[PDB]
Symmetry: D5
Subunit: 69 residues, 10 copies
């Protein structure tokens, strides 16, 4: 899967349908994987650099693959 | 969903029915989403600014949408 | 539910029946709510002030309501 | 010295003259005590509730007394 | 249940059968309680003093009771 | 020097004369040692148990000796 | 099970099939144990030294045993 | 003083002349204020959003004013 | 300088003469280096393993060399 | 100044002459800058990746320039 955006987490959002949205770089993306909710908030809280990989690389696109550095 | 309150978490409360209450700004609101319990306590512990979005924007009103900054 | 004790968590204990015991102020109380186990240890670790509300306000009494400040 | 404001630290600012500004509640106040710079940032980072005591309780007023809870 | 060992967590280990091993003092003990896995790692990470209570107080013995201080 | 109070830090206060006040157990004590200011706030933030040793064991009394556990 | 690699976690990755990949030393390894996802991210965040034990000690190999120091 | 850049700290650098460099947004700026060295590293470590204010808003420019949010 | 003790910090103590005492393993040792006071408390708070090197390897002996792992 | 080593901090050491030694990658290097002592321990504690720049790129060599990521 190709890299979409790399950077620090600007903000995260819990959605009404239980999905989770994250804003990294200039993209707002969402994921339906429940395990990723606490992992991404932890990366936000500790200033980690994350790389999100997805073919739906556009605002509102979904993802499941993330690299935490 | 419209913004209701934005601010730091003043306190949180675990309820007898397993719901979770949060006090942000001048509103006390609750949520029945289990995943949000640890996320909101983490935001409280790290001084994050949260925005709660809900149509029931009054004391005792419920919510499911939160932005963590 | 009336306030029972307010203070910092002195210690916590995982029990053989999977319940969790907490010592706050001069009372040792237990809870059978699984979600509260990590929330109370987090409050212990970060020096939070907690208020436990219960009608069984005596050593060995149970509770489910807690306010985290 | 009378209480001026109580609340969580909204933001802090390092000034050109080496003083430190803090925004708590609806007041922006500054202090010239060097030691308080790291203590206030730590309170900001850990979501502590602080009470600033000063007779110059107005925007731009200075202070030296702070209670950390 | 009698005290077995008291001290800081030296190391922890995730086992192939999903049990968790902990080394406290001069004993290596394991537990099959899933909830204790994150609680013990948190105690390890924050330098907490733990007391493990078990009748199988020998290397390889199991436990379920732990006091976190 | 005899033990005065043992417990968790309830609150700390920076004073106008640059001394630091701490409330542990039922005593409010102060210290004029600059180094202790960040050490005591760190103990407050991490829920450490501290023992303050002083012959002036009364409200307003001073101290310089502290054990961090 | 023999030791494969010992060192600090260089990065972690959540995969599309819900497995988790970790880079320690010169090896990229994955695990299908859900519990290990938050434990390994916590070790990454706190600079812990980990030892991964596996017979598939090569890039892409899987593991279930980890020692956290 | 006008805002120059707002964002998360991408990296920091200790220089041979004892000044400190920070990369925020698309600018690499330095400061000669010793107190700011630990404050900026703490903001980096906790993922804070900072605004640097300076008239020398270009790579290599210096600053002394920072807002920590 | 030969190794004296290796282990986790059991407790630390600020002394009346401004020296700092640490208990590691079965030895209580002190140091007069001011910089080491916050470094050792940080190692205590984060459960680090420290090795103290000193020729005065006995209770009450002094040291200046410490390895933090 | 050319890069010497990049990696996570393996261990740090306080020396008898008040200098500070750090082991990154395959090199043990020291610095005489007092400010860097707490900054490097913080990077060790939070698993940061550091790049040390120095012309004395060999065991025992000194440095003053470090990039914290
Ligand atoms: C676990 C089962 N998944 C599930 O139910 O997902 C439904 C939600 N997905 C969704 O709305 O899918 C819409 C298309 O977008 C996903 C995109 O799909 C690609 C596909 O892989 C390519 O083969 C195709 O050529 O193009 C489409 C459109 O771009 O794949 C992305 C990953 O690269 C995202 O999928 C991933 O993230 C979602 C949301 O979290 C699910 O988890 C997917 O399973 C995961 O693969 C886009 O959503
Ligand atoms: C999926 C599980 N939902 C469920 O069982 O929720 C029952 C709890 N709901 C509740 O008490 O509902 C009372 C009405 O309040 C919710 C409010 O509803 C709006 C509605 O969306 C509008 O269309 C309508 O015009 O007005 C009503 C009243 O204002 O919507 C809020 C969000 O905007 C809250 O709902 C949200 O939060 C609750 C509690 O956490 C549930 O999670 C809902 O699913 C979530 O949408 C008010 O509770
Ligand atoms: C929802 C599942 N509950 C369940 O299985 O609870 C079993 C463990 N409960 C138990 O031992 O209860 C014994 C009585 O003690 C509880 C006490 O009950 C009060 C009651 O509310 C009053 O109306 C009555 O006049 O007096 C009794 C006895 O004092 O209520 C307490 C709260 O105020 C505690 O209950 C709470 O905590 C337990 C354990 O965590 C359960 O979670 C309860 O559901 C919760 O309400 C006392 O245990
Ligand atoms: C360490 C010596 N202090 C010094 O150099 O302070 C100079 C900066 N002070 C300043 O600008 O003072 C201007 C007046 O404002 C201070 C205010 O003063 C009150 C005074 O308390 C009353 O008794 C008087 O009736 O009215 C004046 C005017 O309001 O006192 C405040 C505290 O209550 C503030 O002082 C405190 O904070 C400053 C800045 O950090 C200094 O640290 C002072 O020493 C400290 O007392 C107002 O600044
Ligand atoms: C949840 C149900 N438990 C279960 O499936 O446990 C199986 C794993 N247990 C195990 O291997 O038990 C073997 C015996 O060792 C346990 C020991 O048992 C004592 C017993 O308490 C005495 O009364 C008896 O006289 O002697 C036996 C033999 O020593 O008890 C220990 C506690 O004191 C340990 O049990 C505890 O820990 C295990 C593993 O985590 C289980 O959780 C047990 O439920 C828990 O009680 C020894 O394992
Ligand atoms: C090294 C600089 N010391 C200095 O300037 O101290 C001035 C502030 N001290 C002060 O107000 O002292 C008043 C008396 O109180 C101290 C108390 O003194 C005992 C004394 O040790 C006994 O021998 C005597 O019998 O009784 C008196 C009064 O009870 O000693 C306390 C410790 O046991 C406190 O002193 C300590 O704390 C202060 C303030 O932080 C200084 O740091 C002292 O140096 C330190 O020893 C009481 O303040
Ligand atoms: C929980 C049940 N496990 C399961 O469903 O695992 C499927 C994932 N396994 C996998 O792909 O297995 C492929 C072979 O690699 C594993 C390796 O297996 C060795 C085996 O131990 C030797 O006895 C044999 O001679 O050679 C094979 C080939 O290498 O064993 C490793 C551990 O030493 C790894 O297994 C472990 O990790 C995986 C992934 O997390 C599973 O959890 C296994 O259960 C666990 O044992 C290699 O994956
Ligand atoms: C504490 C005394 N300061 C001192 O010794 O600083 C020497 C380092 N200064 C430096 O190299 O100055 C070069 C010019 O750049 C500073 C810039 O200056 C502007 C000035 O504000 C305008 O009025 C003028 O028209 O143009 C000049 C040229 O740009 O001002 C910046 C702030 O807006 C920076 O200064 C600040 O940061 C430096 C380095 O940390 C010092 O701390 C300054 O005191 C501080 O004001 C540019 O460095
Ligand atoms: C630079 C400031 N030094 C100073 O003022 O130190 C006075 C405190 N020293 C002290 O009490 O010395 C008592 C003897 O104990 C130190 C011990 O000394 C060795 C010596 O190095 C050997 O050459 C000799 O053969 O035996 C003596 C006795 O064992 O050395 C120890 C380290 O190996 C300790 O010294 C270190 O720690 C102290 C206290 O922190 C000072 O920092 C010393 O500078 C430091 O070297 C014993 O205290
Ligand atoms: C602040 C004053 N510095 C001071 O007193 O430093 C004395 C300790 N330095 C030392 O032992 O120097 C020995 C040579 O090693 C340093 C090395 O020097 C280079 C030099 O820059 C080149 O121009 C020359 O061609 O080769 C020599 C040898 O390689 O420079 C290094 C930086 O690249 C190190 O210096 C840096 O670190 C030390 C220790 O912390 C001091 O802080 C230096 O000031 C700092 O520049 C080597 O130590």
């Amino acid at each position: 899967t190709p890299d979409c955006v790399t950077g620090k987490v600007e903000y995260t959002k819990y959605n009404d349908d239980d999905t989770f949205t994250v804003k990294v770089g200039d993209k707002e993306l969402f994921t339906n994987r429940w395990n990723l909710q606490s992992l991404l908030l932890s990366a936000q809280i500790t200033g980690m650099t994350v790389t999100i990989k997805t073919n739906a690389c556009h605002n509102g696109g979904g993802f499941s693959e993330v690299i935490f550095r």
